[PDB]
Amino acid sequence: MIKFFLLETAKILIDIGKADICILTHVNKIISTEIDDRNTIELTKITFYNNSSVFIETHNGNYLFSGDIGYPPDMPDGNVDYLILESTQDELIDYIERLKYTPYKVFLVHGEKEQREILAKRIISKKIRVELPEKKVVLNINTNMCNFASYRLMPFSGFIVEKDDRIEINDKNWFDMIWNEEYNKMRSQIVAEDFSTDQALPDMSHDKIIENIEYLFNIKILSKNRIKEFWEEFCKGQKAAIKYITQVHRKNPNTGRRNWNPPEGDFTDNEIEKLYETAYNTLLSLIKYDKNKVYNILINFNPKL
């Protein structure tokens, strides 16, 4: 492509950095008339043509830089894909028209706005497209059109998002979706009385708590993750541990299951329910004690916490 001239494929400069410059009239190497007209050079076959023109045959596209035109010019007799033409009027026309295999897109350069616009309109009326010059790729994720003043237009206000590889264009549905996601993440960060004043509980002895916790640690009801989340919910207060054990012990009315891990053994249903309420009452009696006492209770089963 050509940047306003640097034409990569290399980075050959026609009249910046890492270039093979080809000066005009009217870096690593400078190519000019040595090679005369009618002779080809390699670098991408480069051939110069007299003006009174650089012709690069690449792998994709055959580029022609014209230079200033004053008199019959000299044009290639092969195949042209891009025609880079200066504009500062009928001389440029026939210079275009008298060339075989008329180019895909021409380029106007080195002039004011009015002359370039007049020549551009004259070339669209000849049915050749023009470009009038004055990076992450951009993706329209949009979806209605208009035709105001012979432009196809859409009234849209939106968001531009910038990632490491692309820039996307999104509407309000994306912003609503991410706002709902972040609102759900923000509201799931707090419970009303975490890490606050210490707050209707059964009471039981320390030795019975040791016996019950050891028995529900042998069979897999009170486990290491259960003691870990129990200690983490106990750190954020008493009511948080109350809410956590009520959530764990909650029997769903639709399925009849609780969040305890089932015991490893041959217990029948009534005994499994007795072990579940035993775990509930044992941990409820455990929330009564001081934090260091509960830490000394639970370090003997979960050494991490």
């Binding site: 299951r257 089932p262 490893e264």
Partner: protein, 199 residues
């Protein structure tokens, strides 16, 4: 070991087939058109879970035979690690030797998946009480999978084939009670060397 077992499993669908969509975004995008979407790929194919069907089939038949096979279908149940299905499909201690794939179809959704309408006929009055549209996979659709057993024994192909006949008997996924999922299986296994790709 130095050998591995590859069982290429080809399914031909004989009855209508439904396996419900599990991705919440895709299901919620499809509930504005169908009440029961088919579990579908992002490359517009159809995938079916296959390890659980084989494990359920083998556990039912081996429990019926009288073998010491655990039930990992019970609520938060742990596999013991000594069953034949524990050696094949897996246990909590070690992973299973059999590496069962999803049943990816050989055809794209617009060619095998059709949108159908089911009703609820009232017992008196014979009227349409409820009406729901669900997606299904047509008969004659071909699915493919590769079951990959890392440490082959003598009874790995036989138990996989018996589980495939049980899946042919009872159905592979979805509404198995209404007649959906009755399919047929072709099996082409080959014991490949483990060092095959090195050369």
């Amino acid at each position: 070991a130095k050998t591995m077992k590859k069982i290429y499993v080809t399914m031909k669908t004989l009855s209508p087939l439904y396996t419900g969509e599990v991705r919440r975004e895709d299901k919620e995008a499809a509930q504005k058109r169908v009440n029961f979407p088919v579990r579908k790929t992002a490359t517009n194919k159809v995938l079916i879970p296959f390890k659980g069907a084989l494990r359920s089939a083998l556990e039912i038949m081996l429990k019926a035979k009288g073998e010491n096979v655990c039930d990992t279908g019970e609520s938060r149940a742990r596999p013991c690690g000594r069953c034949v299905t524990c050696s094949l499909f897996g246990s909590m201690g070690r992973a299973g030797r059999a590496s069962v794939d999803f049943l990816i179809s050989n055809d794209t959704k617009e060619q095998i998946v059709r949108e159908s309408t089911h009703l609820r006929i009232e017992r008196q009055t014979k009227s349409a009480s409820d009406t729901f549209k669900g997606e299904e996979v047509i008969e004659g659709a071909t699915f493919t999978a590769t079951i990959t057993i890392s440490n082959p024994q003598e009874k790995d192909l036989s138990l996989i084939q018996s589980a495939l006949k049980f899946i042919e008997e009872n159905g592979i996924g979805g509404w198995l009670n209404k007649g959906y999922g009755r399919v047929s299986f072709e099996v082409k296994s080959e014991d490949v060397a483990t060092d095959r790709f090195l050369k």
